[PDB]
Paper text:
Ras protein is a small GTPase involved in central regulatory processes such as cell differentiation, proliferation and apoptosis. It possesses multiple conformational states and acts as a molecular switch between an active, GTP-bound state, and an inactive, GDP-bound state, controlling essential signal transduction pathways. Two segments of Ras termed switch I and switch II correspond to the regions that exhibit large conformational changes upon transition from the GTP- to the GDP-bound state. Ras structure consists of a central β-sheet core (β1–β6) surrounded by a bundle of 5 α-helices (α1–α5).
To minimize potential experimental bias and to provide accurate comparisons between structures, we have first solved a reference structure of Ras(wt) in complex with Mg2+·GppNHp at room temperature (RT) and ambient pressure (AP) in the same experimental set-up and environments. The phosphate binding loop, the switch I region, the G4 and G5 motifs involved in nucleotide binding are well defined. This confirms that it mainly corresponds to state 2(T), the dominant state at ambient pressure. In our structures of Ras(wt) and Ras(D33K) at ambient pressure, Gln 61 is oriented toward the nucleotide while this residue is usually oriented toward a symmetric molecule in the crystalline packing. Our Ras(wt) structure at ambient pressure is probably closer to a state 2(T) structure than to a (still unknown) possible state 3(T) structure with the exception of the Gln 61 side chain, locally shifted as in a state 3(T) conformer. At ambient pressure, its side chain is rotated toward the bulk. At ambient pressure, the equilibrium between structural state 2(T) and state 1(T) observed in solution is abolished in the crystal.
Numbering used by the authors: 1 to 166
């Protein structure tokens, strides 16, 4: 069956792992558990297609940049995640996108911009600003909560649909 290699990137603590674990294991992880590199494989049916999602969960910490680059190289699509209460993680998106472009030698790779932690009332990044950034890159913007599961399937399934249209 078709295998889609999806890579989840973004600053430390934005919820990359929580989103992935919500998808795969149906539970919200509330603990402090920094990732080095983890990979998940799950068989799913998306729009009637049987496919294997191979999800590569990366570290947000800059010490692991080399390893992150190796993994980004094999990826077919990327989830670029920031948190809606963390303005620095939003600013850092440009830098993760630029690295993806350099690693893939491409101006256009299937990607979705994800604004996570949308359950939180204390928002510092407005949906309007994120949407303007996404439009400037030519990619979809999805808001998610790993805590409530809002947007979780949408983010991953939208990415797969983008890979299908590349
Ligand atoms: N309220 C809320 N909290 C979240 C959400 N997603 C993650 N968190 C919390 O934020 C913290 C970090 O989440 P985690 O998934 O570990 O982030 P990460 O991006 O994978 N960090 P790293 O880059 O170190 O691997 C955890 O305490 C987690 O429970 C969310 O959608 N809403
Ligand atoms: Mg993590």
């Amino acid at each position: 069956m078709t295998e889609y290699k999806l890579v989840v990137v973004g600053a430390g603590g934005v919820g990359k792992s929580a989103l992935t674990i919500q998808l795969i294991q149906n539970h919200f992880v509330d603990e402090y558990d920094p990732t080095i590199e983890d990979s998940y494989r799950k068989q799913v049916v998306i729009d009637g297609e049987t496919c294997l999602l191979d999800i590569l969960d990366t570290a947000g910490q800059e010490e692991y940049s080399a390893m992150r680059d190796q993994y980004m190289r094999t990826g077919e699509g990327f989830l670029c995640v920031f948190a809606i209460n963390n303005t620095k993680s939003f600013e850092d998106i440009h830098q993760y996108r630029e690295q993806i472009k350099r690693v893939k030698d491409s101006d256009d790779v299937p990607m979705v911009l994800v604004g996570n932690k949308c359950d939180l009332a204390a928002r510092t990044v407005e949906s309007r600003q994120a949407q303007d950034l996404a439009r400037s890159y030519g990619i979809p913007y999805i808001e998610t909560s790993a805590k409530t599961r809002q947007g979780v399937e949408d983010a991953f399934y939208t990415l797969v649909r983008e890979i299908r249209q590349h």
